[PDB]
Amino acid sequence: AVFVPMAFFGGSTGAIYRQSITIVSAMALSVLVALILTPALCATMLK
Amino acid sequence: GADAKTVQDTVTQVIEQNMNGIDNLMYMSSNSDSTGTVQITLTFESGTDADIAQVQVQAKLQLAMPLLPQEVQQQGVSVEKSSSSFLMVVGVINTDGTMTQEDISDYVAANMKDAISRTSGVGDVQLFGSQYAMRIWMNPNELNKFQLTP
Amino acid sequence: DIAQVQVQAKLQLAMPLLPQEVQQQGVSVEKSSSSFLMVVGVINTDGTMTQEDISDYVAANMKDAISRTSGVGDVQLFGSQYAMRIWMNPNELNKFQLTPVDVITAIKAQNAQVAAGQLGGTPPVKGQQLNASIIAQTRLTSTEEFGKIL
Amino acid sequence: LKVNQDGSRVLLRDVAKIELGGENYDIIAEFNGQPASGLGIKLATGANALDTAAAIRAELAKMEPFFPSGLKIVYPYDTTPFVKISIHEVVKTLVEAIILVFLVMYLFLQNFRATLIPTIAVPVVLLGTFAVLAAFGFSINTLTMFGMVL
Amino acid sequence: DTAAAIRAELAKMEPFFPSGLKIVYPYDTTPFVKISIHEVVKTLVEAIIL
Amino acid sequence: GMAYLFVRLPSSFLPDEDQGVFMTMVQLPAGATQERTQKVLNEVTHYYLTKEKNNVESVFAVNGFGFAGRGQNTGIAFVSLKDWADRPGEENKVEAITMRATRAFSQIKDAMVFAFNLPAIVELGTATGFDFELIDQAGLGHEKLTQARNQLLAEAAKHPMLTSVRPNGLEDTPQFKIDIDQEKAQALGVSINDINTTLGAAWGGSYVNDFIDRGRVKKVYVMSEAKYRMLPDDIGDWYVRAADGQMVPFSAFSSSRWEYGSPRLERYNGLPSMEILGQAAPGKSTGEAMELMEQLASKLPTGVGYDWTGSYQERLSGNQAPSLYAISLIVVFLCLAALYESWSIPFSVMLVVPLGVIGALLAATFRGLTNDVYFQVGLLTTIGLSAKNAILIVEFAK
Amino acid sequence: GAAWGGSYVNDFIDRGRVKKVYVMSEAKYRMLPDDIGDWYVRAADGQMVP
Numbered sequence: 001a002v003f004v005p006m007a008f009f010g011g012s013t014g015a016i017y018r019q020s021i022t023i024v025s026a027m028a029l030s031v032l033v034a035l036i037l038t039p040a041l042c043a044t045m046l047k
Numbered sequence: 048g049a050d051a052k053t054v055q056d057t058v059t060q061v062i063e064q065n066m067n068g069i070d071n072l073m074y075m076s077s078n079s080d081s082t083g084t085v086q087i088t089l090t091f092e093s094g095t096d097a098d099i100a101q102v103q104v105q106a107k108l109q110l111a112m113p114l115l116p117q118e119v120q121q122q123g124v125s126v127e128k129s130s131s132s133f134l135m136v137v138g139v140i141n142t143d144g145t146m147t148q149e150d151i152s153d154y155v156a157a158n159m160k161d162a163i164s165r166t167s168g169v170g171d172v173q174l175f176g177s178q179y180a181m182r183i184w185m186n187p188n189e190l191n192k193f194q195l196t197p
Numbered sequence: 198d199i200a201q202v203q204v205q206a207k208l209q210l211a212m213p214l215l216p217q218e219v220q221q222q223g224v225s226v227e228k229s230s231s232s233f234l235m236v237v238g239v240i241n242t243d244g245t246m247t248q249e250d251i252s253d254y255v256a257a258n259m260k261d262a263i264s265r266t267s268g269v270g271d272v273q274l275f276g277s278q279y280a281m282r283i284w285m286n287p288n289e290l291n292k293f294q295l296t297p298v299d300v301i302t303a304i305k306a307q308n309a310q311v312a313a314g315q316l317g318g319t320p321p322v323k324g325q326q327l328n329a330s331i332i333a334q335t336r337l338t339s340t341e342e343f344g345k346i347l
Numbered sequence: 348l349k350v351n352q353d354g355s356r357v358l359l360r361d362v363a364k365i366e367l368g369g370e371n372y373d374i375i376a377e378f379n380g381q382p383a384s385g386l387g388i389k390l391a392t393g394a395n396a397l398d399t400a401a402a403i404r405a406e407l408a409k410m411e412p413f414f415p416s417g418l419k420i421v422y423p424y425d426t427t428p429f430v431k432i433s434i435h436e437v438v439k440t441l442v443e444a445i446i447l448v449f450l451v452m453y454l455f456l457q458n459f460r461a462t463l464i465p466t467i468a469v470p471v472v473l474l475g476t477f478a479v480l481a482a483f484g485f486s487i488n489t490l491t492m493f494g495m496v497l
Numbered sequence: 498d499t500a501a502a503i504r505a506e507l508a509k510m511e512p513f514f515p516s517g518l519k520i521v522y523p524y525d526t527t528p529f530v531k532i533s534i535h536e537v538v539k540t541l542v543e544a545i546i547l
Numbered sequence: 548g549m550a551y552l553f554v555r556l557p558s559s560f561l562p563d564e565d566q567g568v569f570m571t572m573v574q575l576p577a578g579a580t581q582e583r584t585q586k587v588l589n590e591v592t593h594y595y596l597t598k599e600k601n602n603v604e605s606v607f608a609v610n611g612f613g614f615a616g617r618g619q620n621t622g623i624a625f626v627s628l629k630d631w632a633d634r635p636g637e638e639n640k641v642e643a644i645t646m647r648a649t650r651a652f653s654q655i656k657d658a659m660v661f662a663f664n665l666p667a668i669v670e671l672g673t674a675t676g677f678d679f680e681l682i683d684q685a686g687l688g689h690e691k692l693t694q695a696r697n698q699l700l701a702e703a704a705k706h707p708m709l710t711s712v713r714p715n716g717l718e719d720t721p722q723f724k725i726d727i728d729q730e731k732a733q734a735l736g737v738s739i740n741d742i743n744t745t746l747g748a749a750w751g752g753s754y755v756n757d758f759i760d761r762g763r764v765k766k767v768y769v770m771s772e773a774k775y776r777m778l779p780d781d782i783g784d785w786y787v788r789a790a791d792g793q794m795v796p797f798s799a800f801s802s803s804r805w806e807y808g809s810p811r812l813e814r815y816n817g818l819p820s821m822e823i824l825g826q827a828a829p830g831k832s833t834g835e836a837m838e839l840m841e842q843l844a845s846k847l848p849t850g851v852g853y854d855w856t857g858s859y860q861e862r863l864s865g866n867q868a869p870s871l872y873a874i875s876l877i878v879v880f881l882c883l884a885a886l887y888e889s890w891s892i893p894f895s896v897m898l899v900v901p902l903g904v905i906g907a908l909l910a911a912t913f914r915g916l917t918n919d920v921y922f923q924v925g926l927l928t929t930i931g932l933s934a935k936n937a938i939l940i941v942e943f944a945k
Numbered sequence: 946g947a948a949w950g951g952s953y954v955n956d957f958i959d960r961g962r963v964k965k966v967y968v969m970s971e972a973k974y975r976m977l978p979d980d981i982g983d984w985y986v987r988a989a990d991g992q993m994v995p
């Protein structure tokens with residue numbers, strides 16, 4: 001919500017402060033990838 | 048042929064007091080040149096569906112076609128999706144068997160223009176020249192010589 | 198939005214089989230709601246005018262704007278827009294040997310806009326200096342000019 | 348046209364010149380001072396742009412073989428290759444942001460496998476984000492590609 | 498919302514009226530809506546108070 | 548500092564980039580011909596070929612078609628720049644190319660030629676720019692509206708933290724009216740139908756009927772050899788036929804005289820109107836310019852209102868930016884409490900904000916960039932990276 | 946038709962706006978049955994006919 005509030009758009013600048021969302025999807029996928037997986041790989045193999 | 052004032056109230060105005068009862072509309076603007084050409088823009092809200100907004104507009108012009116000259120009815124009336132700007136501009140020239148800026152303009156509009164404009168959702172196509180036509184240049188001295196008119 | 202269009206794209210296939218009186222009159226396909234909501238009355242107080250002077254000003258400034266604004270279905274004028282009205286006397290018609298067919302022909306000739314061409318266009322002689330639009334018959338403007346039709 | 352008294356015939360050519368030429372002489376173009384026409388296509392208010400321009404080549408490509416001697420296509424004013432630069436100088440930028448990061452991970456941790464786990468934790472996230480924009484309506488835009496870099 | 502924008506165009510028209518021309522408002526639905534909110538959200542508030 | 552380095556930092560919307568493709572338009576004065584404007588488009592092609600071979604791959608001039616509208620008074624060359632690799636410096640990039648192109652066309656010419664950049668965007672969002680429009684609301688005419696707009700453009704240029712203003716659509720050129728005295732016509736026996744299709748189908752042309760050339764149905768047009776329709780005196784060369792079998796010249800019933808009109812009648816929203824295309828001052832910025840043009844419109848005569856065509860409906864660093872940022876705080880605090888529990892934790896992360904911002908403003912204000920879209924999103928990426936770094940400082944320590 | 950019922954002839958311009966021109970009759974020559982014979986059409990041979 002630094003991002004999506006700003007992605008509530010206004011007029012001809014519609015898809016401009018909008019497509020955040022592109023970058024919130026990116027945030028929640030990096031959270032996902034990190035809540036899953038990174039846990040795995042880190043354990044699986046490191047030193 | 049029509050001058051700027053002629054088109055202003057024989058075509059332009061007639062359509063403008065018959066461009067109502069339409070869903071979504073911010074404003075309407077217009078031009079009326081001395082070259083006998085009128086063009087109205089009905090701008091809608093942000094992403095109003097252009098597939099239906101185009102239709103509503105051109106199903107309202109139809110109620111005012113009978114109140115225009117028969118010259119304008121048989122000429123090209125149109126309601127199209129606009130994007131004030133070009134993108135692809137395919138030039139066409141000759142190299143070996145050289146031809147004119149008129150021979151080339153006809154071949155463009157009699158083989159490849161009609162295909163382009165219908166292909167992959169093109170808004171409108173502007174010919175950079177003119178399609179051929181049986182042109183007749185009346186001489187008024189050889190018209191009075193046999194007692195005749197156009 | 199689409200049910201209106203389908204209906205008015207079907208009426209169009211039957212417009213040529215109607216009288217030319219009905220074609221040049223107002224045909225319409227509109228979204229209905231058997232009932233009014235806002236009914237803006239219009240009157241005069243100080244510089245008093247009639248129930249006819251007010252009805253024209255309503256339909257020649259503010260009616261066309263209302264009906265296109267914020268999705269209005271249809272607008273019903275409570276009066277009538279002005280029109281060059283002509284009340285033919287049949288006694289002063291037989292007195293000069295005439296009919297309403299001769300009156301009608303005189304208005305579709307003297308009251309008209311003609312599309313004359315233009316000096317200097319369209320394909321000129323290479324070396325012309327000027328290019329202006331020719332004006333011709335202009336549509337009449339006032340009650341006096343309609344009185345002076347021959 | 349006529350048969351004058353003595354059995355003489357007035358023909359259409361006897362009063363007027365007759366040549367096959369364009370229906371409008373108002374505009375004529377020149378490709379580097381060489382006589383030329385062309386199709387100046389404009390977009391359709393929602394169309395897919397570079398997909399639409401790819402299919403402008405579709406029809407155009409089937410037209411090329413049946414050209415008179417000399418007729419050749421040329422390409423001024425073209426948007427297409429600007430898109431090819433905004434991908435190959437963004438997905439290249441993408442790749443440099445790994446390459447450089449890869450070093451920072453080695454600099455701080457000499458363990459190789461350690462400089463790897465984060466190098467897989469972003470290529471995957473990139474792709475998952477492509478699958479959400481496709482599912483929501485958006486496209487690979489100049490804007491949404493800059494959001495893969497930020 | 499449509500009736501609010503009937504005032505939108507109408508408001509820009511008022512200033513350029515001839516001497517005497519004035520707008521009046523018979524048969525109007527708008528204020529019935531203003532009563533069905535201010536006598537419902539008021540009712541709302543009384544249902545707490547009580 | 549974070550304030551001062553932000554208020555003073557100017558506001559744009561989006562960069563006007565080199566797009567490998569720009570163009571330039573032509574415009575001639577009152578009543579010029581096709582031969583005249585072709586001379587100007589020729590001189591334009593030479594700057595782009597003879598004086599610019601390194602940077603220009605091609606040119607595509609078009610006689611008598613401006614992007615204003617149409618007529619033999621106009622033109623447009625579509626430029627296609629050589630690829631980006633062969634153009635090395637800032638010298639050989641659109642900003643620089645269109646700079647010395649405009650200078651060359653203003654120096655060795657006597658018409659009106661420019662060379663505008665290629666936005667991207669659309670026509671709108673010029674920034675420090677507006678589009679006014681002047682309406683005839685009452686029952687005035689063209690002559691009374693024209694005079695009112697002259698007063699609006701003059702009051703603008705007689706008390707400007709200034710302003711620049713430009714019509715350039717109406718120009719205002721003469722017209723050749725032909726009064727056909729109707730009593731003179733029907734006396735000698737000519738129909739007014741016959742006369743109108745003589746003047747109309749000779750000078751202006753007339754679409755008669757369709758034919759077939761080489762399979763495809765095209766049109767048949769009827770007009771005249773060019774030389775019998777160039778000047779005023781060739782009207783009398785045409786002879787109409789009257790009832791009684793004899794010929795009758797145009798000079799018999801017609802009457803020649805000139806008259807001032809306009810080759811571009813525009814109308815906004817069912818009413819006559821004329822466009823005003825002023826850009827805001829280099830000092831002021833839009834909101835100020837528009838409101839100091841509104842009090843000029845109310846000082847004008849009766850039956851003369853206005854309406855803003857039409858840019859925009861509500862802007863971005865203007866109004867919008869606030870409301871969004873506003874809520875963006877409102878949540879940031881809420882959710883920093885959904886995992887934290889206090890009235891102290893959130894504040895810590897909620898004043899890292901300006902740490903990272905004065906840095907962003909420093910680089911932006913320092914180099915020749917500005918608060919546009921790309922700056923307005925690197926800002927929010929940074930409050931995400933500020934709370935990130937911070938939250939680590941907090942979480943671990945708590 | 947153009948006397949009793951009226952007939953839309955052609956468009957003109959009043960004060961800028963295009964309106965209509967209508968042709969009918971003074972009211973008193975079209976109120977009752979007997980005013981039908983007041984109208985005289987023209988026949989080929991130049992004379993009037995009721």
Ligand SMILES: O=C(O)c1cn(C2CC2)c2cc(N3CCNCC3)c(F)cc2c1=O
Nearest residue numbers: 009014015018092093094095096483484485
């Ligand atoms: O008019 C337009 O261009 C758009 C209109 N709408 C609203 C529906 C009328 C949109 C709605 C969107 N979202 C609604 C909330 N759920 C996610 C999708 C959207 F992302 C884009 C648009 C437009 O571009």
Ligand SMILES: O=C(O)c1cn(C2CC2)c2cc(N3CCNCC3)c(F)cc2c1=O
Nearest residue numbers: 563661662663664665673711712713715826
């Ligand atoms: O009078 C005119 O026709 C124009 C006037 N101006 C200046 C503003 C008064 C223009 C300015 C332009 N640019 C300014 C610098 N940023 C890019 C846009 C432009 F491209 C075109 C024109 C005109 O056509």
